Amino acid sequence: YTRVVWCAVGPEEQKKCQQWSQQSGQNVTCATASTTDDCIVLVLKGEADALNLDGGYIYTAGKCGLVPVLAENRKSSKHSSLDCVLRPTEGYLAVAVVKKANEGLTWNSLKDKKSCHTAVDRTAGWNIPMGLIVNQTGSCAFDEFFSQSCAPGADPKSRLCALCAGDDQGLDKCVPNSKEKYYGYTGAFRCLAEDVGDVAFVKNDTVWENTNGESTADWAKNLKREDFRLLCLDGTRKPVTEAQSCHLAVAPNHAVVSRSDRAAHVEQVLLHQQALFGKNGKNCPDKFCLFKSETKNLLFNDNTECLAKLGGRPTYEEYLGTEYVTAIANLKKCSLEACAF
Ligand SMILES: *[C@@H]1O[C@H](CO)[C@@H](O[C@@H]2O[C@H](CO)[C@@H](O[C@H]3O[C@H](CO)[C@@H](O[C@@H]4O[C@H](CO)[C@@H](O[C@@H]5O[C@H](CO)[C@@H](O[C@H]6O[C@H](CO)[C@@H](O)[C@H](O)[C@@H]6O)[C@H](O)[C@@H]5O)[C@H](O)[C@@H]4O)[C@H](O)[C@@H]3O)[C@H](O)[C@H]2NC(C)=O)[C@H](O)[C@H]1NC(C)=O
Ligand SMILES: *[C@@H]1O[C@H](CO)[C@@H](O[C@H]2O[C@H](CO)[C@@H](O[C@H]3O[C@H](CO[C@H]4O[C@H](CO)[C@@H](O)[C@H](O)[C@@H]4O)[C@@H](O[C@@H]4O[C@H](CO)[C@@H](O)[C@H](O)[C@@H]4O)[C@H](O)[C@@H]3O)[C@H](O)[C@H]2NC(C)=O)[C@H](O)[C@H]1NC(C)=O
Numbered sequence: 464y465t466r467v468v469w470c471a472v473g474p475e476e477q478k479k480c481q482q483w484s485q486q487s488g489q490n491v492t493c494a495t496a497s498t499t500d501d502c503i504v505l506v507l508k509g510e511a512d513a514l515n516l517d518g519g520y521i522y523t524a525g526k527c528g529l530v531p532v533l534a535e536n537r538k539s540s541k542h543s544s545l546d547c548v549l550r551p552t553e554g555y556l557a558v559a560v561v562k563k564a565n566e567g568l569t570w571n572s573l574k575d576k577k578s579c580h581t582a583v584d585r586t587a588g589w590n591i592p593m594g595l596i597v598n599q600t601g602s603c604a605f606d607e608f609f610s611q612s613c614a615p616g617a618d619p620k621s622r623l624c625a626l627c628a629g630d631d632q633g634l635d636k637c638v639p640n641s642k643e644k645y646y647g648y649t650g651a652f653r654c655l656a657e658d659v660g661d662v663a664f665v666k667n668d669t670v671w672e673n674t675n676g677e678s679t680a681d682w683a684k685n686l687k688r689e690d691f692r693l694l695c696l697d698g699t700r701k702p703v704t705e706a707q708s709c710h711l712a713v714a715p716n717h718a719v720v721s722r723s724d725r726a727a728h729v730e731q732v733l734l735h736q737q738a739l740f741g742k743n744g745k746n747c748p749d750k751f752c753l754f755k756s757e758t759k760n761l762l763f764n765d766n767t768e769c770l771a772k773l774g775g776r777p778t779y780e781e782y783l784g785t786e787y788v789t790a791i792a793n794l795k796k797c798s799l800e801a802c803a804f
């Protein structure tokens with residue numbers, strides 16, 4: 464009657480999608496691809512309907528016709544009387560994080576160090592820090608800036624993948640999906656935590672959700688926030704409590720996208736699904752919780768409170784904002800209307 468095919472990236476997302484499919488009585492069904500870009504293509508072909516995307520991918524999807532439908536909303540102190548689904552989004556803070564013990568490392572001495580990125584093309588892990596680095600160095604050779612990195616989605620034989628570890632068997636090194644040990648917000652933070660890299664380009668929230676006992680993961684259980692510092696654009700180092708005055712930029716929240724012609728439909732189904740498996744849902748945590756995967760951020764971020772309606776009914780450019788869009792455009796000149804497929 465009103466059924467939606469979700470696109471999952473990699474085997475772990477596929478498994479979560481299947482459980483959701485099952486519990487939804489197949490109001491939702493699953494398609495799987497190895498990368499986010501491949502999922503976008505399935506959506507364009509009409510073989511999948513939707514998936515939730517980081518803003519860097521929304522820019523890609525947007526140029527090819529896809530539109531934002533609902534956005535991730537997390538916990539807030541302000542707008543509190545308003546229901547989550549109607550509450551305006553706030554965005555997240557992109558930060559650069561280092562170990563306190565790595566003394567004297569600042570924004571201005573990052574050259575030739577080792578970096579941990581969520582994935583190529585993502586907002587906090589790539590577009591913001593590389594855009595800044597390209598601007599302040601006046602060169603498009605962002606591949607020669609760090610000595611070694613893990614940036615999932617880059618050429619596996621390049622320096623940008625040297626620090627990537629692949630899966631439990633060493634396969635799939637540097638793939639941009641959760642099979643890669645250092646992929647995503649959690650993987651990049653882990654890459655820093657294990658001292659594989661000197662700096663991780665993540666979001667403020669990641670630091671908090673993976674320290675001081677907030678995560679039981681064996682690599683994270685003994686991590687304390689005091690052992691980390693944020694790098695500020697002014698060359699200072701600050702504690703992680705100061706992200707409001709020490710971030711690289713404010714990113715637009717991850718959002719669900721779909722083909723324009725399927726948007727109304729996707730929106731209707733998802734609003735019903737979250738009533739069922741969302742934060743206060745009929746069936747979470749009883750049977751299935753859509754916004755939980757045990758700090759793995761599968762399909763949606765684990766800190767998501769709800770998916771919220773947009774309003775003003777954005778175009779992708781308005782959703783991302785003119786500040787962010789010009790940032791991406793300029794970075795992309797190193798590698799304006801065309802379809803990347
Ligand atoms: C970086 O990322 C991290 C991780 O995402 C961010 O940290 C997180 O922030 C949230 C809150 O923003 C944490 O949430 C929770 O903690 C709350 C505090 O214990 C819990 O209780 C409150 O929840 C309610 C929200 O609905 C709110 O309740 C009210 O607060 C009023 C004041 O704001 C209060 O009024 C009294 O307040 C004062 C008392 O001393 C007096 O001055 C006043 O006169 C008055 O008496 C009301 O009575 C009422 O209680 C309130 O906003 C609290 O948040 C809540 O249940 C929940 O558990 C979240 O845990 C936390 N994550 C982690 C891992 O720590 C961080 O903010 C980010 N940083 C940046 C810069 O963005
Ligand atoms: C790397 O460097 C790149 C080169 O600088 C950089 O590219 C871009 O950098 C600028 C930031 O986007 C951009 O400048 C524009 O400035 C104006 C911003 O004005 C509006 O916003 C302000 C918000 O802070 C408000 O205070 C003002 O009220 C104002 O509204 C542009 O907007 C105009 O706004 C007013 C209307 O109020 C009006 O006069 C205009 O009609 C228009 O609406 C203005 O047009 C500039 O575009 C700059 O153009 C752009 N540079 C290039 C070459 O594209 C990139 O951001 C850097 N990368 C990173 C990651 O930092």
Ligand SMILES: *[C@@H]1O[C@H](CO)[C@@H](O[C@@H]2O[C@H](CO)[C@@H](O)[C@H](O)[C@H]2NC(C)=O)[C@H](O)[C@H]1NC(C)=O
Binds near residue numbers: 488490739
């Ligand atoms: C599968 O989707 C359908 C459509 O939303 C759901 O069936 C609806 O049940 C509600 C609850 O009263 C009614 O308002 C609708 O009229 C029903 N739709 C029709 C006309 O078939 C069903 O709840 C969904 N199942 C799950 C588990 O998500």
Ligand SMILES: CC(=O)Oc1ccccc1C(=O)O
Binds near residue numbers: 775783784785
């Ligand atoms: C509010 C929405 O339409 O757009 C924005 C929000 C912040 C900054 C810029 C924009 C915009 O449209 O450019």
Ligand SMILES: [Fe+3]
Binds near residue numbers: 518586587714
């Ligand atoms: Fe992101």
Ligand SMILES: [Zn+2]
Binds near residue numbers: 712713
């Ligand atoms: Zn700021």
Ligand SMILES: [Zn+2]
Binds near residue numbers: 775778781
């Ligand atoms: Zn508009």
